[PDB]
């Protein structure tokens, strides 16, 4: 019921069209089964004149009816084809829209292929219910109502005998349908987990071939595929087990009216002909009722598919407070007041984190491998909301300013250099879409990026592969820095941006990058200590604790953790 009223509730703005769908199909329903009756009416009149006389008069009506039925059947499909694809488009858009509001944590823990299956497979699974299936539903009930009226006008008592076995046929259907929903739901989630393994291997197939884990990855696929095969057989049987099983239920009715009506014909209650004609009208009653029951199993099949879609359409979103305020005149006043945060919630990452940064200051942060330097960055990004503490940007709190207006003047380059499938020009256009070629070209030359862009076979309009694998790790990092500077942010963060890039190229950018850094609040995180000594305020973090704070020369003379890192270089 939960997804039944939910999925079928998407047809609500198109209710006015659905009434017309019902009207156009009813005409095709009252003329479709009337075809052998239409021929018999003509012959009954032209039984005496044999040929001609009134025969050419009846042929003119017969031809116009079949021409009308063919014109309306195409008309029924055309109006429904657009209506069906609109619901399919709606659920697919709704799935995508929710993902952008849903927190980062979800993406890091759920499989990437699982969402892919939810977008394509799960939406292509509900594509069958939206189409001819809805048309046959309206066609079924009218043929059922059209048969029950013909039934009672011929036989009254015997029509009740055929209707008495109807709730028993529904009773068994309710058991089969529930079992079909029980199996198709499991079929999809297993496929969802299996689809994730496909994306997992494609993104990093080099690692699999090198360690000879190709056999282990094959049996990893086989272990889920065998569970998919075993549950898939049982799901496909239940999907089509109701139609042949209903034949035995129908055959009971054929034997029932032959006995119950046979008892009347013997005692001379109702003539043998009253039962001999009733068998033909009982066939036009059973056929649509079983068709509706078979198409009740298929809706339950789609109900299981729709159930997997609403699982994400019910998942929490990053919401802005109703008293939201847009940040006017951004300068970059970073403020921290005793911040304590836990990433995994099992082990605390950060303990007592506090610092005040003036607008347009150069700030450096360095320490050991796996301390909590990158964690502070994403807290400022508001990817993971503060557990205990206070963070204020430009005098106003992080929670008070809306997520879009807060991130408006924030720029970041990640450890995992991420590149889109789009062109180099469009990738660099991120942040500032209204940036001319003059701004794109000049920025590349300043940070040693243009050197390899012109070297490409296409140039600036070159297509980028999976995570931009067409260029080396160092070249990829340089493009991200250009992308970050092009957006023109007041607050700038460069997380390991100069790790893959060589020390020789780094010196050529060192001064040019610092010349663009002026008038902007900057926070840089990198292990290369001989490139972060230009920073005004330097903070040292170890095991998620602030041990040292102050100028570069002050850290050297004090002889601590900063001194231990600097000396260990050579």
């Amino acid at each position, epitope marked *: 019921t939960a997804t039944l009223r939910r999925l079928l509730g998407y047809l609500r703005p198109h209710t006015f069209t659905l009434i017309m769908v019902f009207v156009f199909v009813t005409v095709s329903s009252i003329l479709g089964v009337l075809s052998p009756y239409l021929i018999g009416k003509t012959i009954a009149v032209v039984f005496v004149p044999r040929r001609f006389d009134l025969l050419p008069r009846y042929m003119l009506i017969l031809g116009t009816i079949y021409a009308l039925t063919s014109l309306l059947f195409w008309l029924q499909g055309k109006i429904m084809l657009t209506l069906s694809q609109d619901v399919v488009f709606r659920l697919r858009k709704e799935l995508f829209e929710k993902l952008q509001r849903v927190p980062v944590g979800f993406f890091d823990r759920t499989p990437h292929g699982d969402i892919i299956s939810r977008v394509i497979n799960d939406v292509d699974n509900i594509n069958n219910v939206l189409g001819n299936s809805i048309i046959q539903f309206f066609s079924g009930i009218v043929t059922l109502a059209g048969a029950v009226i013909m039934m009672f006008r011929v036989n009254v008592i015997l029509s009740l005998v055929t209707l008495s076995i109807v709730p028993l046929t529904v009773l068994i259907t309710q058991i089969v349908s529930s079992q079909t929903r029980k199996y198709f739901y499991e079929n999809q989630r297993v496929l969802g987990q299996l689809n994730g393994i496909i994306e997992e291997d494609i993104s990093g197939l080099t690692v699999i071939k090198l360690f000879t884990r190709e056999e282990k990855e094959m049996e990893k696929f086989d272990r889920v595929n065998e569970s998919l095969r075993k549950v898939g057989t049982k799901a496909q049987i239940f999907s089509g087990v109701l139609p042949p099983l209903m034949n035995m239920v129908n055959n009971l009715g054929f034997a029932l009216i032959s006995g119950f009506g046979g008892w009347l014909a013997l005692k001379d209650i109702i003539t043998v002909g009253t039962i001999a004609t009733f068998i033909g009208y009982s066939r036009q009653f059973t056929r649509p009722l079983n068709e509706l029951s078979n198409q009740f199993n298929m809706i339950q099949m789609a109900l299981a598919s729709a159930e997997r879609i609403f699982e994400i359409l019910d998942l929490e979103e990053e919401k802005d407070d109703p008293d939201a305020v847009e940040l006017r005149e951004v300068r970059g006043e970073i403020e921290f007041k*005793n911040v304590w945060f836990s990433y995994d919630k099992k082990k605390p990452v950060l303990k007592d984190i506090t610092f005040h940064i003036k607008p347009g200051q150069k700030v450096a942060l360095v320490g050991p491998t796996g301390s909590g330097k990158t964690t502070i960055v994403n807290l400022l990004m508001r990817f993971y909301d503060v*557990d*205990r503490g206070q963070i204020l940007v430009d005098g106003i709190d992080i929670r008070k300013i809306k997520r879009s207006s807060l991130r408006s003047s924030i720029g970041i380059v990640l450890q995992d250099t991420i590149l889109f499938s789009t062109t180099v020009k469009e990738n660099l256009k991120y942040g500032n879409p209204g940036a001319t070629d003059e701004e794109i070209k000049e920025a590349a030359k300043l940070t040693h990026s243009d050197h390899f862009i012109k070297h490409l076979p296409e140039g600036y309009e070159t297509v980028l592969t999976d995570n931009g694998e067409d260029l080396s790790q160092g070249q990829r990092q340089l493009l991200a820095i250009t992308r970050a500077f092009l957006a023109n942010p007041k607050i700038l963060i460069l997380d390991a941006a100069t790790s893959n890039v060589d020390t020789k190229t780094e010196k050529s950018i060192q001064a040019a990058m610092w010349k663009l850094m002026e008038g902007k609040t900057s926070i840089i995180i990198a292990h290369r200590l001989n490139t972060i000594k230009n920073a005004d305020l330097i903070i040292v973090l170890r095991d998620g604790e602030i041990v040292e704070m102050g100028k570069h020369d002050e850290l050297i003379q004090k002889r601590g953790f900063y001194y231990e890192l600097f000396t260990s270089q050579y």
Partner: nanobody
Amino acid sequence: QGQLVESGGGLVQPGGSLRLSCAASGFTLDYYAIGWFRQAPGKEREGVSCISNSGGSTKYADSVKGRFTISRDKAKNTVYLQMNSLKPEDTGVYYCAADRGYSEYDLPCDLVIYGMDYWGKGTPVTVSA
């Protein structure tokens, strides 16, 4: 459902002290962070003291220093806040905090909360002559 219950105090002339308990239903004082808040009607929403974990955490307010005595129950799950010698400075609807704790850290003091604003229901104890 995760909700808090706040009760205690009536109408006392400035000088006395009132017992105010923040009873938690479906929440234990052994881990979660629950703290009282000095909230005025139509004005700003300040805090009292945010105490968490079974081990215990010492905390008090800055406006009225060392006068909001706190105590925690391990079995009853209640936080008693006895305002030692009341003043008409702090009058209005007081609130408690739900989730955003897990263990023990520092709490200085205001919490996030996505639901409405703060969970516990405001009890008005006006201490004016």
